[PDB]
Structure 1
Amino acid sequence: SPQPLEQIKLSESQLSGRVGMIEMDLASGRTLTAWRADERFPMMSTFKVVLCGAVLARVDAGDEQLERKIHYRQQDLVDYSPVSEKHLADGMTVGELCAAAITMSDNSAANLLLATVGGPAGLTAFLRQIGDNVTRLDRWETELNEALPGDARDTTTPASMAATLRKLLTSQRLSARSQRQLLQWMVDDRVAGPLIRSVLPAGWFIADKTGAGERGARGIVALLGPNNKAERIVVIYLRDTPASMAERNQQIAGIGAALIEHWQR
């Protein structure tokens, strides 16, 4: 592979799309690689990590319990509810809902959680409270990943998302247990985690949430590092490419390969 920046550029050439990318030390926030890092990209399902950060902030404040069982109706369900459609009779706990949203990208679970934090407006206000003045959620599942050209709704920037993830995982805004829980949900991703492990060299840690949307939108927020450590946050978003899902996956994996081959920077 070429250097990470060379590879990011190649990916834009080969996709005819914009790529946005931050590589950041998790412990310190040192920015290593930044490409279009202040440009907007649709969050798509990556917003689910931020969502559960807001849920955990409520748990810490004593305003929520991960144990609390939520009962819901079939008419409440939206497209893509692999876990939540199985629990119409018995409900799901708030913690189960976050696990389903993050690890399975269950959309009804995400909407159920979104209501508890005050909807898109409430989650945006939470972002503002933790010092993210850029990221915004405007819509519910499943309309939020429409990715219309020039539309600022439901967007983040690579720099904002990486900073926000670092705040939630490491900054003591969340309690120790909550930080540990958010991390474990990302480790437990079933959508992309096992697939990424299968192509990663032995010794590399991965935790992640992925997203996809219209007009080629694609993304991943991840923790990655050698020696089985979550050394760096890596945020990659793609937009406005007509490429197949497979090619968008391969290009993101290519940026990953470049990082792996040239890790010491």
Structure 2
Amino acid sequence: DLTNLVAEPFAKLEQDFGGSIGVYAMDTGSGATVSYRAEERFPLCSSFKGFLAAAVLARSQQQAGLLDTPIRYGKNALVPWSPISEKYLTTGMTVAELSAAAVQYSDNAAANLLLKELGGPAGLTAFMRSIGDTTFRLDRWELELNSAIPGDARDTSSPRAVTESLQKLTLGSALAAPQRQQFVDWLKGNTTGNHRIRAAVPADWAVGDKTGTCGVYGTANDYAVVWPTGRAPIVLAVYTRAPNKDDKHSEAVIAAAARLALEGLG
């Protein structure tokens, strides 16, 4: 199999990039995996917002009316990159709309308001422990969680823990069937990842994804569930970082790493 023939191409890719690339991909058919730096910590950046939305849905299972609960917020809630929350400043938005905004537009104000609802970064971390993720940690809010300082474990996970948690939430039994499909539909409607894992995948394969872009230390990422035509779904996570604050992230590198991960599962 091709599982142990991706290390050299990944090394070449991270050397051309000027940093570190972390990948974990899982064929849910065979159980086969592709692993490269899959147990190293990488900053989550905005990628935590997918798991934030999952945590809201998990709580909605035992709390009727959570998703339709109106959240009234002031201008003080608006932080940079809040493209949806900005437009509903005067009316407020439901828990469901904030969740959709956080997943599909990486809306920062929406993410912070939802974090408040779940008991802050500690609350989301506790949710991730409750589905058996012992790696994920969120420590800060938007936008301070984006500092992405080399060796700083704050606001990080591993590509493997991300992929495993994503599998449990989208395909396993961590969410009830309506909540599971809603999480899948939110990820499928993501607008920020067209130049990442989606660019590594045939156009007629269904894809749901959540992106992260710290804006520093060449630190960016994408995770996705992929449904190949007539085959068991594939789950994968691609995380990058670089040693200098002004190193540029690359969407093309994330796409190329996704292509290698999928080819590696051949």
TM-score, scaled relative to structure 1: 0.90
Q: CA deviation at 1:78?
A: 1.2
Q: What is the deviation of 1:162?
A: 0.8
Which one-letter code corresponds to 1:72 in the other structure? Y
Pick one of 233, 248, 255 that aligns with 1:244. 248
Q: Is 1:187 aligned to 2:188, yes or no?
A: yes
2:33 alignment counterpart: 32
Q: Are 1:82 and 2:104 counterparts?
A: no
3-state SS, counterpart of residue 217 of structure 2: helix
Question: Structure 2: where are the runs of 5+ without partners?
Answer: none
Query: What is aligned with 1:223?
Result: 225
Note if contact 2:187-2:210 (Cα within 8 Å) is conserved in structure 1.
yes
Name the CA distance, whole Å, in 1 between partners of 2:168 and 2:181: 13
The corresponding residue for 1:23 is: 25
Specify the code of the residue in structure 1 equivalent to 2:139.
D
Q: CA deviation at 1:71?
A: 0.6
SS at match of 2:112: helix
State the one-letter code of the partner of 1:216. Answer: G
Q: Which amino acid aligns with 1:240?
A: A
Please say if residues 11 and 251 of structure 1, whose CA atoms lie closer than 8 Å, have aligned partners that are also in contact. Answer: yes
1:252 and 1:84 map into 2 onto residues whose CA distance is 28
Deviation at 1:251, TM superposition (A): 1.3
Q: How does 1:60-79 map to 2 (within 5 A)?
A: 60-62=61-63, 65-79=66-80
* Aligned equivalent of 1:148: 149
Task: Give a deviation string over 1:116-158, Cα, whole Å, max 9, x none.
Answer: 1110011111111111111100000011111011111000001
Letter in 2 for 1:223: V
Shift of 1:205: 2.6
Q: CA deviation at 1:7?
A: 2.8
Counterparts of 1:25 and 1:92, CA distance in 2: 37
Separation in 1, partners of 2:22, 2:83: 30
Deviation string 1:161-188 (CA, Å, 9 cap, x unpaired) is 1111111112222110000000000000
Q: Hey, what's the Cα distance between the residues in 1 that align with 2:145 and 2:119?
A: 16
User: 1:72–1:194: structure 2 CA closer, same or farther, 3 Å change rule?
Assistant: same
Residue ranges of structure 1 left out of the alignment (5+ in a row)? none
Question: How many Å apart are 1:255 and its aligned residue?
Answer: 2.0
Checking the alignment, whether the CA contact within 8 Å between 1:58 and 1:64 is kept in structure 2 is no
93-102 or 191-200, larger mean C-alpha shift:
191-200
Percent identity between the two aligned chains: 41
Residue 112 to residue 196, structure 1, CA distance change in 2 (3 Å): same
Contact 2:204 2:229 in 1 (8 A): yes
* 1:235 alignment counterpart: 237
CA distance in 2, matches of 1:37, 1:199: 19
For 2:261 and 2:123, locate their aligned partners in 1 and report how far apart those are by CA, in whole Å: 36
Change (3 A) 1:89 1:37: same
Task: Decide which of 253, 256, 264 is 1:254's aligned counterpart.
Answer: 256
**3-state SS, counterpart of residue 215 of structure 1:** coil
* Paired residues of 2:200 and 2:256 also in contact (CA < 8 A): no
Contact 2:200 2:259 in 1 (8 A): no
Task: With the length of structure 2 as denominator, give the TM-score of the two structures.
Answer: 0.90
Amino acid paired to 1:171? G
Cα distance in structure 2, aligned partners of 1:264 and 1:135: 25
CA distance, structure 1, for counterparts of residue 60 and residue 189 of structure 2: 21
106-115 or 235-244, larger mean C-alpha shift: 235-244
Whether contact under 8 Å (2:136, 2:156) holds in the other structure is yes
Give RMSD over aligned pairs: 2.1
Aligned length: 259
Look up the SS of the partner of 2:25 in the other structure: strand
Shift of 1:196: 6.1
Kindly indicate whether the alpha-carbon contact (under 8 Å) linking 1:193 and 1:207 is maintained by their aligned counterparts in 2: no
Between the aligned partners of 2:203 and 2:49, the Cα distance in structure 1 is 28
Cα-to-partner distance string for 1:38-89 (whole Å, 9 max, x where unaligned): 1100011110011111101110011652111111000111111100011111
Determine the structure 1 residue equivalent to 2:204: 203
- By how many angstroms is 1:225 displaced? 4.3
The structural deviation recorded for 1:264 is 5.2
**Aligned counterparts of 1:97 and 1:5: Cα–Cα separation in 2:** 39
